[PDB]
Amino acid sequence: EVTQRELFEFVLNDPLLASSLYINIALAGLSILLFVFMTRGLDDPRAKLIAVSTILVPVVSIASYTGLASGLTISVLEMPAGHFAEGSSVMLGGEEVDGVVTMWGRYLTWALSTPMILLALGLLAGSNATKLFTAITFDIAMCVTGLAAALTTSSHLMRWFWYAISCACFIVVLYILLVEWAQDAKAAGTADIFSTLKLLTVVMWLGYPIVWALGVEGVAVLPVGYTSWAYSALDIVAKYIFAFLLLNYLTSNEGVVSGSI
Amino acid sequence: EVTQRELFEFVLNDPLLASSLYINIALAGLSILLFVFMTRGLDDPRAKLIAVSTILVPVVSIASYTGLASGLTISVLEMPAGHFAEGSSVMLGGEEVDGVVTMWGRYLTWALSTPMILLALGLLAGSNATKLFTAITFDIAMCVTGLAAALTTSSHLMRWFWYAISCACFIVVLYILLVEWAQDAKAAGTADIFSTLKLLTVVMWLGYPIVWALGVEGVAVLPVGYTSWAYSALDIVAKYIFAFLLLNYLTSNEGVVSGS
Amino acid sequence: EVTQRELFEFVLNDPLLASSLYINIALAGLSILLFVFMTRGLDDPRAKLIAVSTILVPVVSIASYTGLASGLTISVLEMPAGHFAEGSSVMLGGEEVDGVVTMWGRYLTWALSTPMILLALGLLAGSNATKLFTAITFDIAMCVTGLAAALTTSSHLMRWFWYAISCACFIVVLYILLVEWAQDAKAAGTADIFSTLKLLTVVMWLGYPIVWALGVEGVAVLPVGYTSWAYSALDIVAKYIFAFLLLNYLTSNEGVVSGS
Ligand SMILES: CCCCCCCCCO[C@@H]1O[C@H](CO)[C@@H](O)[C@H](O)[C@H]1O
Ligand SMILES: CCCCCCCCCO[C@@H]1O[C@H](CO)[C@@H](O)[C@H](O)[C@H]1O
Ligand SMILES: CCCCCCCCCO[C@@H]1O[C@H](CO)[C@@H](O)[C@H](O)[C@H]1O
Ligand SMILES: CCCCCCCCCO[C@@H]1O[C@H](CO)[C@@H](O)[C@H](O)[C@H]1O
Ligand SMILES: *C/C=C(C)/C=C/C=C(C)/C=C/C1=C(C)CCCC1(C)C
Ligand SMILES: *C/C=C(C)/C=C/C=C(C)/C=C/C1=C(C)CCCC1(C)C
Ligand SMILES: *C/C=C(C)/C=C/C=C(C)/C=C/C1=C(C)CCCC1(C)C
């Protein structure tokens, strides 16, 4: 019964929710412009690959956040028995609707952007194709099983089982970042910048499953609006500032990563 | 709740709609047969890569069009206030239903076929991996944001914002075709044939956002039936004749494109 | 009206259906741990690429089967006129509901796992990029048109048309497996292991379109519960035992697949 328009209007009229969404559409757009400008002098094909992969992060982000803001990738789901958000109401259109406003579109943002973050980092670290393939495939599995968890309403236990599977995939990604590429970067001559970006990425990425657990999808100590801002704040650092820092290094060290595709 | 059968029946009984879909299903099938025949002499792995990528175009087209013809990838959507198609109704089953018959399945056709056209062109021009990656990623973003625009019913302005984002992605693809690959093709020794396929692709591709703006998705000067035929006509040229021209060149110049 | 919980409960409380799903979740899970353990000694990057691609098979399987078991990837569809399952009922929850419980989630299991099976096999056979690309693309087309067939309710004949398209794509994959990779494997020095894996794959894969035609999706001689177990039994072989065999060889011939 809930229409896209009703959800679009619910987001508007809800200061927290509206701001957490529209601020990122704005920051993503500005980031694209800034990043394109910064990388204008790049000529080496390998350097340009790192640049495009990084720039695709805010491109995916602006489109995906528009998906949420428009109401296209938002749904109202009723949580299963025992879920801390069970029996919640939302007030849409004009009546009280059972369920929780679920911004599942965020998982699309993650599924399409995290592979680009990983591609950029792997290339920076001088990774071989095997580790890149492993990091990217498990990263995608992580995001998709996370979406499945959020979309599951049949059983409370099932939701957390998906969450556990997602975490396991996340561990694969963390192992590659912390152990494999950490060492590869030394041979690539990007040890300093990779270690910094590696640590920044690990710290911020760890925040997502924590927010999931604490937010409306998990134990719900954080209401819908606050869960959204938690994710948007993480996104601002894990995507935009992260990309700005990587591009800052790249544009001053093209020769170091020049090599060959 | 409109059924898949009701939309399938709607396509039928509606001349322009039925013809625009089934004629492309038929042409796609015939194209695949012809292309397979045309390329049985190929032996070079690189020449064969270009050939398979090209043949995948009509393969995606026949499956995707069947998705539309069957009603599977069609939905009825109610446009937002201010949209020229808002207030429209359609006869489905035994009742009048509010909304517009939306052939969103066409976006699946484009999202799966355009990357193959780009891959064939890039390989032909001797493009490096970075440019191929750039062209294909932005091409997919263009098709997906285009689909998002067609699926947005909450706000008229939002629909056009998606449209703008999609256009920006399109500009990236255009730049690579017109500037980068045009130059790369000279080193690959395929400057002439690339020039022909490039001109064809750029002109035809530019037609899609125009049809979008004029059709039911946009200001609706073109009814659902004319919108479909407009897109179908473009597909015939951008897909089938494009593929023929490329394959006709490939089968006579296998030596030129042969490589790593 | 049918909720996710109702389909979730339908699977549970139905010994046949529940066993066919939850058993594969367990086998997939145990397989991942077993394979990771078995390959812990690999050092060569090419060998590791084959191992990870193979390991992703049970990874996709455990996630996909959970999608089915949870009810997330299951729907209730009413078959079209003429379909042998037309006018069927099921009793979702405690009410008699028209249609057939359709576990379309299986197609996601296939579309995501088969490419990994093919990439592993192709690499083992020392396939060039062209054949890998050809096999994988037509394999995905096969899975997606198969899904389209299962999801089509507008026409009985349309379902079989999709089926035909999917079969045509399957033939392409079979040709690469049986003719081309069989030859490549010789030059790669993996002829004997490939022969074993090739036979197992061709035989098991042939079973799916057979189960489709015989099950509720096709002529419906096999009820929903038996159709599920038929696919599950095939999965156990085409995925888990196939993976064990490939990995057992891989870890014993790391040097051969490395090259230099
Ligand atoms: C910066 C991103 C650009 C997207 C801008 C989308 C916001 C458009 C909001 O429009 C307004 O919405 C109200 C509630 O639906 C209507 O009552 C009103 O008549 C309409 O004018
Ligand atoms: C690392 C994460 C830890 C996972 C924690 C998951 C525990 C939630 C279990 O759900 C509960 O299970 C009961 C028995 O099945 C149901 O009766 C009840 O209604 C349901 O709400
Ligand atoms: C990493 C985060 C850990 C997740 C912890 C989630 C545990 C959920 C506990 O909920 C409770 O479970 C009981 C059954 O055990 C129900 O009877 C009760 O009604 C329900 O409210
Ligand atoms: C390997 C992990 C797989 C997860 C399996 C989840 C099983 C949890 C079943 O819970 C029960 O489901 C019934 C029907 O919905 C409820 O009536 C009952 O109250 C609830 O306790
Ligand atoms: C731009 C977005 C970024 C960098 C997103 C990162 C997301 C994750 C690391 C998400 C991880 C999750 C789990 C490990 C468990 C289940 C839920 C998720 C999806 C939040
Ligand atoms: C076989 C199909 C082809 C070649 C399709 C091409 C499609 C495009 C070039 C579409 C472009 C669009 C925009 C630039 C703006 C928004 C709407 C679209 C999706 C029609
Ligand atoms: C792990 C799953 C595997 C190996 C699945 C293999 C599936 C196929 C070979 C399916 C083939 C089909 C056809 C050829 C015709 C139409 C229906 C299908 C999808 C069942």
Side-chain angles (χ1 to χ4, degrees), chain A residues 2-261, chain B residues 2-260, chain C residues 2-260:
Chain A
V2 180
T3 69
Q4 209 188 89
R5 178 191 160 194
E6 298 178 315
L7 293 171
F8 166 79
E9 278 174 32
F10 177 85
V11 171
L12 291 176
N13 298 305
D14 182 330
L16 269 187
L17 210 49
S19 61
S20 74
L21 254 34
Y22 289 92
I23 288 306
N24 280 172
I25 287 176
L27 289 177
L30 291 173
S31 291
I32 293 165
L33 299 176
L34 174 63
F35 299 164
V36 169
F37 177 68
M38 293 176 66
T39 55
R40 208 167 179 298
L42 252 35
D43 290 302
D44 182 73
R46 187 168 189 281
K48 294 183 102 172
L49 212 214
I50 292 176
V52 190
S53 187
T54 305
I55 286 171
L56 278 166
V57 175
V59 169
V60 164
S61 191
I62 192 168
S64 205
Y65 267 97
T66 298
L68 294 168
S70 70
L72 179 59
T73 55
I74 295 178
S75 292
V76 172
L77 305 180
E78 295 184 53
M79 294 298 102
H83 187 285
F84 283 57
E86 72 190 305
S88 299
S89 297
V90 294
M91 215 61 67
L92 272 45
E95 288 61 60
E96 189 174 302
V97 181
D98 287 339
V100 301
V101 172
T102 304
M103 304 219 292
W104 59 265
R106 281 193 181 283
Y107 296 85
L108 286 57
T109 304
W110 305 339
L112 298 171
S113 67
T114 53
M116 296 302 94
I117 287 176
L118 256 23
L119 216 209
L121 281 175
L123 290 173
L124 179 67
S127 171
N128 64 25
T130 297
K131 295 176 187 174
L132 231 13
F133 174 87
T134 306
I136 293 175
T137 52
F138 280 93
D139 170 84
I140 293 174
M142 172 187 80
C143 296
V144 176
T145 51
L147 170 62
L151 253 35
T152 295
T153 64
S154 62
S155 159
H156 189 194
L157 197 60
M158 272 286 202
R159 288 179 62 88
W160 292 100
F161 178 60
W162 283 114
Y163 180 94
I165 298 180
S166 185
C167 287
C169 294
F170 183 34
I171 295 177
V172 175
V173 177
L174 292 170
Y175 179 93
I176 288 173
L177 286 164
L178 296 171
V179 180
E180 300 297 321
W181 293 347
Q183 298 306 302
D184 286 343
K186 298 184 180 184
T190 55
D192 291 352
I193 181 68
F194 180 74
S195 192
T196 302
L197 296 179
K198 170 206 64 181
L199 225 54
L200 180 63
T201 293
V202 171
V203 175
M204 298 305 105
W205 286 41
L206 286 171
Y208 292 80
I210 291 174
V211 171
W212 197 101
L214 293 169
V216 67
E217 294 152 316
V219 68
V221 285
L222 278 41
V224 177
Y226 302 81
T227 61
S228 184
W229 251 113
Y231 284 134
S232 291
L234 291 173
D235 276 1
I236 291 176
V237 181
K239 290 171 159 70
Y240 319 138
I241 71 93
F242 159 89
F244 184 36
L245 300 182
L246 184 40
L247 262 23
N248 175 238
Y249 167 83
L250 183 60
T251 182
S252 285
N253 293 278
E254 183 176 14
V256 178
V257 307
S258 62
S260 304
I261 311 174
Chain B
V2 297
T3 65
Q4 201 189 92
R5 186 194 62 176
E6 295 178 316
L7 293 167
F8 164 72
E9 296 172 303
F10 173 83
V11 173
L12 298 173
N13 302 297
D14 186 333
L16 289 176
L17 208 56
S19 57
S20 65
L21 269 34
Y22 290 95
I23 291 301
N24 271 178
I25 287 178
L27 286 179
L30 290 173
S31 291
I32 299 176
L33 295 175
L34 172 65
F35 301 160
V36 168
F37 167 65
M38 288 177 69
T39 59
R40 295 195 74 178
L42 284 59
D43 291 298
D44 182 67
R46 188 161 190 286
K48 295 183 75 69
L49 206 203
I50 296 178
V52 181
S53 189
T54 302
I55 295 172
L56 277 169
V57 175
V59 170
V60 167
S61 188
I62 193 179
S64 204
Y65 265 98
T66 299
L68 292 171
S70 70
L72 180 62
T73 54
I74 298 178
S75 288
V76 177
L77 302 183
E78 294 176 50
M79 295 299 98
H83 189 288
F84 287 87
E86 173 283 318
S88 297
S89 301
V90 61
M91 229 54 61
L92 267 51
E95 249 289 58
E96 190 169 302
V97 184
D98 294 339
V100 177
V101 171
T102 308
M103 319 291 272
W104 61 265
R106 281 192 179 284
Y107 295 87
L108 276 54
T109 305
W110 312 340
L112 295 171
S113 68
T114 52
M116 295 301 178
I117 289 171
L118 256 23
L119 181 281
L121 287 178
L123 288 171
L124 180 66
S127 171
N128 61 29
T130 300
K131 298 184 191 174
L132 257 321
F133 174 85
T134 304
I136 294 174
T137 53
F138 276 94
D139 171 82
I140 292 173
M142 174 190 73
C143 294
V144 176
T145 52
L147 167 65
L151 262 25
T152 294
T153 62
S154 60
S155 156
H156 189 195
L157 179 56
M158 268 296 188
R159 290 180 61 89
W160 291 101
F161 180 55
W162 283 114
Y163 182 96
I165 291 174
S166 186
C167 286
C169 296
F170 184 32
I171 291 171
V172 176
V173 176
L174 288 171
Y175 182 93
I176 290 172
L177 289 169
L178 298 165
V179 181
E180 306 280 18
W181 291 350
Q183 187 63 27
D184 292 345
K186 303 175 181 179
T190 54
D192 288 310
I193 182 60
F194 183 81
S195 179
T196 297
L197 301 178
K198 174 199 66 179
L199 216 302
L200 186 53
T201 297
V202 176
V203 172
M204 295 302 95
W205 283 42
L206 281 170
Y208 293 81
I210 291 171
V211 173
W212 195 98
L214 301 174
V216 295
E217 287 155 324
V219 302
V221 294
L222 269 55
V224 64
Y226 284 66
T227 60
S228 183
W229 253 119
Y231 285 133
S232 287
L234 293 171
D235 282 357
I236 292 174
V237 183
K239 291 180 161 69
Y240 318 137
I241 76 160
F242 157 90
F244 174 74
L245 297 173
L246 180 47
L247 259 28
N248 198 205
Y249 164 83
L250 191 65
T251 175
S252 293
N253 297 278
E254 185 178 359
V256 182
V257 304
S258 65
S260 304
Chain C
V2 294
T3 73
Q4 203 187 87
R5 182 185 62 170
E6 302 181 324
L7 282 304
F8 165 74
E9 284 172 21
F10 177 73
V11 168
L12 280 182
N13 311 309
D14 183 346
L16 270 178
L17 209 55
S19 66
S20 72
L21 263 41
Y22 287 94
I23 291 307
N24 277 165
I25 289 180
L27 290 174
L30 292 172
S31 289
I32 296 170
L33 297 173
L34 175 66
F35 300 161
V36 173
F37 184 70
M38 291 175 61
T39 53
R40 69 185 185 293
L42 283 56
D43 290 315
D44 179 70
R46 187 162 189 287
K48 287 183 177 177
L49 212 212
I50 297 176
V52 179
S53 183
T54 304
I55 291 178
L56 281 166
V57 173
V59 168
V60 168
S61 187
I62 195 177
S64 299
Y65 268 101
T66 297
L68 288 170
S70 67
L72 180 60
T73 58
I74 299 183
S75 297
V76 175
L77 305 181
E78 298 185 60
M79 293 301 96
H83 192 285
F84 287 64
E86 67 182 302
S88 293
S89 293
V90 186
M91 188 184 136
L92 279 118
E95 304 296 61
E96 219 74 299
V97 179
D98 285 348
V100 302
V101 172
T102 306
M103 298 198 275
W104 59 266
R106 279 193 180 285
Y107 295 93
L108 279 54
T109 300
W110 307 344
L112 299 171
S113 60
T114 51
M116 296 301 92
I117 289 172
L118 256 18
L119 182 278
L121 271 179
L123 286 169
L124 182 71
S127 171
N128 63 21
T130 299
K131 296 180 192 169
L132 259 323
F133 177 90
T134 304
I136 294 173
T137 56
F138 277 95
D139 171 80
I140 292 178
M142 171 187 79
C143 293
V144 181
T145 51
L147 168 58
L151 272 40
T152 294
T153 63
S154 60
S155 158
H156 184 200
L157 180 62
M158 257 297 175
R159 291 176 63 84
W160 291 101
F161 177 57
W162 281 116
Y163 183 96
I165 294 175
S166 182
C167 281
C169 294
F170 183 35
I171 273 55
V172 174
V173 178
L174 291 170
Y175 179 91
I176 290 176
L177 288 174
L178 297 168
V179 181
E180 286 289 358
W181 286 353
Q183 295 309 316
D184 288 345
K186 298 185 179 182
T190 56
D192 285 338
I193 178 62
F194 180 74
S195 299
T196 306
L197 298 179
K198 178 194 70 184
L199 183 65
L200 190 60
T201 299
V202 176
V203 176
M204 293 304 105
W205 283 42
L206 277 171
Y208 293 79
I210 292 176
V211 171
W212 194 101
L214 295 171
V216 300
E217 288 155 329
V219 72
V221 292
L222 276 53
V224 59
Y226 295 77
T227 58
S228 187
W229 251 120
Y231 283 132
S232 289
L234 291 176
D235 277 359
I236 291 172
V237 182
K239 288 180 164 72
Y240 318 139
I241 81 161
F242 159 97
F244 175 72
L245 290 168
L246 178 45
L247 250 31
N248 204 198
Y249 166 84
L250 183 64
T251 177
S252 291
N253 292 269
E254 182 171 357
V256 180
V257 303
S258 69
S260 300

